[PDB]
């Protein structure tokens, strides 16, 4: 018996990135349930400013049973839904690629045009011609979001959603 | 296993050997055979002139001998006394009995874990040397402790 939406604590061990969802397990460390295990998954948000865990498949020691209490997680000592990880994964790479491709295009074309008013010609060549395909490819690939990845040694707290027996 | 004692507490073989050597070089007789141990102490270094009143300075010696005794898990300990012929037989027999009683009482007060302690004194009825010129200085007039180590 668990009250409708009370607090529990556990610790996760298996580190995972928000790239390919799959089974993730945590272990309850306190409360009436000790040694209990909880496997579930996560959800991909539109903005990577946070991360929560969909935890539904609970197995408690003692008897061979499989309950399905589904609940989420909040960061201990933070009391929020955010995840402690890095968020600047893929801004600078795409920014630099796009900017460099554009600069190449501009340099080639402008120094070609400024002829009226051989190595400089070759620079014009390389820039004005390799910038363009790189620019279109970079615009094609510019839309990848920033991933978030949990770590292998972080604890967590669980607020319940439904009651069990 | 990890919390089980490694050895019997309050026991060190190096300490045992060291203090046995110290007692032997100080002259108190220590004898060992099999696992039966005997200790002999001249009565001159313990009591007054044929009196059952231990000298004050001997308390250090008693402390040392009890400290040695504490390393052995034992069951029964016997303490007997021998003396010289002074006036009668009953006189020195009672004297030896009293001396043995006093030393036994002090040892029992001390923490020597045994089950049984027997005590007696037989005066000059067990001579060990023809030389009987001296009185309390004679070697035969003495006290002795016997015991057997268990396990």
């Amino acid at each position: 018996i668990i009250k409708t939406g009370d607090i529990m604590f556990a610790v996760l061990d298996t580190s995972v990135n928000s790239d390919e969802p799959g089974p993730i397990l945590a272990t309850i460390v306190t409360g009436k349930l000790k040694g209990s295990k909880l496997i579930g998954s996560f959800n991909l948000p539109s903005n990577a400013d946070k991360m929560v865990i969909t935890f539904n498949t609970m197995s408690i020691p003692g008897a061979e049973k499989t309950i399905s209490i589904s609940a989420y997680a909040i960061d201990p000592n933070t009391a929020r839904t955010a995840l402690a990880s890095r968020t600047n994964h893929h801004y600078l790479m795409r920014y630099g690629s796009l900017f460099a491709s554009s600069f190449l295009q501009g340099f080639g074309n402008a120094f070609q045009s400024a002829n009226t008013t051989s190595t400089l010609e070759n620079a014009v060549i390389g820039l004005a011609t390799v910038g363009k395909a790189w620019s279109q490819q970079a615009q094609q690939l510019f839309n990848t979001p920033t991933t978030v990845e949990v770590y292998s040694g972080t604890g967590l707290g669980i607020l319940f959603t439904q009651d069990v027996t | 296993v990890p919390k089980l004692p490694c050895r019997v507490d309050g026991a060190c073989d190096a300490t045992i050997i060291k203090m046995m050597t110290d007692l032997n070089k100080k002259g108190i007789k220590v004898a060992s055979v099999g696992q039966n141990y005997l200790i002999s102490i001249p009565a001159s270094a313990l009591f007054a002139d044929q009196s059952p009143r231990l000298n004050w300075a001997s308390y250090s010696l008693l402390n040392e001998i009890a400290a040695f005794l504490k390393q052995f898990r034992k069951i029964a300990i016997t303490v007997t006394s021998y003396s010289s012929k002074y006036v009668s037989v009953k006189r020195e027999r009672a004297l030896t009995l009293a001396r043995s009683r006093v030393v036994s009482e002090y040892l029992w007060s001390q923490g020597v874990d045994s089950r049984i302690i027997f005590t007696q004194g037989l005066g000059s009825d067990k001579p060990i040397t023809s030389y009987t010129l001296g009185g309390d200085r004679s070697p035969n007039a003495r006290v002795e402790i016997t015991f057997r180590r268990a396990v």
């Binding site: 020691p61 | 004692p5 019997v8 073989d13």
Partner: protein, 78 residues
């Protein structure tokens, strides 16, 4: 840690005696098997002098000995 320290040294462990042997023929101080004579007074665990700890676990945190007695001091408290 030398059991036969300042002696002849370790000879062998007599199991029937449950004791080590020093090379000089004097019995050592250490033990070498659980089948020896140790002075045992202090013990750990709970449900002592009862049916022991019941192997089956309950949802409640109370623990009851196999003879039916409940050990509050072993059970965690509210």
């Amino acid at each position: 840690d030398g059991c036969c320290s300042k002696m002849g040294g370790i000879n062998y462990c007599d199991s029937s005696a449950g004791r080590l042997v020093c090379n000089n023929g004097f019995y050592s101080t250490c033990y070498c098997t659980r089948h020896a004579v140790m002075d045992l007074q202090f013990l750990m665990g709970c449900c002592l002098w009862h049916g022991g700890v019941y192997p089956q676990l309950n949802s409640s945190g109370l623990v009851v000995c196999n003879d039916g007695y409940v050990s509050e001091e072993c059970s965690l408290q509210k």
